[PDB]
């Protein structure tokens, strides 16, 4: 708890100049994610996902980043959830990594596309057994009349699955968010943040500094 | 750093039952905000604000909560920023308090309205002198060709204001987000979160538990 405090002070010694930026924004994201992990932030892979309903109202919630590469950033969710309904009507989403403990933010803008069954199955059968079970329990985002509904169904499903592999719910899936824009924010001198926007354009990245 | 660790363990000993909920959601928000402050989270008042552009694309960034009451939650920003432009075309916003260090989230849905000059002036002239200056420096969200633009203007404005009260920029203002919905999330038993939605309806709050 002094080792962690020290690491956070070192990773917060930030300037951020254009000439030190990598060509691929995911190189910088990888570096900051590794620092969030080493500094033991709570849930370093946690990201706030924003979606928009049919009335133009934005909604937000935290999800975990499970995978990223050039094709985008992946999370898993219940396909009957509010976020899945909103994505089906409007695939435009924003992701924000709230790394303000290290004076950082990352924001990703892109379109969410569903994962295939093969991808979902691979991830599901990597989860701890008790995570597989919980995925069955909850009709995510529906009104429920009592907490006991969850607790009862959890007990029943434990009993039902006890002596086999936990099957994949038909209602569990995932989304990959394309990399149209990636924005980096790092606290800077005189409380003037360094801010860079990577914009995907003509199979390349256009980088601009933004005023904070 | 053992005192903080202990406080975080105590405030994370959560069950959340309907019968223990306050009538006014801001009573529970006040309690969780006070706990985030006592546990020394980074920026306990930090909230992620989501807005939507004219194409239906959501955007996100962190701002600080400055004030809250029944009329809504207040933040300050530069009126030429992307968020201010997006609000002018679509006043629907979401706020999320990323308190996952204490296994919590709070989300607020409502409409953003501008603050009056008298309100903006009162807050501006409470800021530290060096905060007043910085508010002049940056054409928030515009592309800038170099970091030095910020550093130069900061030095010039320091010199210009040295021996007087720092005047209020015409381009600095704020927004109050109405309380249409407030949602509380707290990590729960068997990794099944307690989730409650307060929905404003007929001059009252309708509370429902949501499945996690
Ligand atoms: C740290 C943390 C991680 C979470 N990870 C996920 C996740 O990966 N997927 C998911 O569906 N919900 C996750 N949740 C729950 C969501 O925030 C949200 O409550 C749920 O997905 C329902 O969102 P919706 O009603 O807007 O669709 C997480 C919550 C927290 C606090
Ligand atoms: C902890 C923290 C607090 C911040 N507080 C504010 C704020 O209160 N107001 C503000 O305009 N920007 C604030 N920012 C900067 C915003 O996240 C964002 O970079 C800026 O407002 C531009 O957003 P826009 O280009 O989307 O309009 C904060 C950033 C962090 C990391």
Residue numbers in the entry:
A (entry chain AAA), B (entry chain AAA): 7 to 218
Quote the study that presented this structure, word for word.
In Escherichia coli, PLP formation is catalyzed by pyridoxine 5’-phosphate oxidase (PNPO), a homodimeric FMN-dependent enzyme that is responsible for the last step of PLP biosynthesis and is also involved in the PLP salvage pathway. By using FMN as cofactor, PNPO catalyzes the oxidation of both pyridoxine 5’-phosphate (PNP) and pyridoxamine 5’-phosphate to PLP, reducing molecular oxygen to hydrogen peroxide. We have recently demonstrated that ePNPO undergoes an allosteric feedback inhibition by PLP, through a mechanism in which binding of substrate at the active site and binding of PLP at an allosteric site negatively affect each other to a large extent. We recently showed that an ePNPO quadruple variant (K72I/Y129F/R133L/H199A; ePNPOqm), which has a drastically reduced capability to bind PNP (and therefore PLP) at the active site, is still able to bind PLP at the allosteric site.
We crystallized this quadruple variant in both the absence of PLP (ePNPOqm) in P31 2 1 space group and presence of PLP (PLP-ePNPOqm) in P61 space group. The final model of ePNPOqm was refined to 1.56 Å resolution; the asymmetric unit contains a 212-residue subunit (residues 7–218; the entire polypeptide chain is made by 218 residues), one FMN molecule, two sulphate ions, one phosphate ion, and 174 water molecules. The second subunit of the dimer was generated by the crystallographic 2-fold axis. The quadruple mutant conserves the structural elements of the wildtype protein: five alpha helices, numbered from H1 to H5, and ten β strands. In addition, in the PLP-free ePNPOqm the N-terminal region is also visible, folded in an additional α helix (H0, residues 5–18). The β sheets core region is flanked by H1 (and H0 in PLP-free ePNPOqm) on one side and H2 on the opposite side. In this structure of ePNPOqm without PLP, the interactions between two key residues of H5 (subunit A; Arg153 and Glu157) and residues Glu195, Leu198, and Asp200 placed on the 192 to 200 helix (subunit B) are particularly important to maintain these structural elements linked together and correctly folded. In the ePNPOqm structure, the Arg197 displays a position similar to that of the wildtype protein. No PLP is present at the active site of either structures, although PLP-ePNPOqm was crystallized in the presence of excess PLP (see Experimental procedures section for details); this is evidently a consequence of the engineered active site variants.
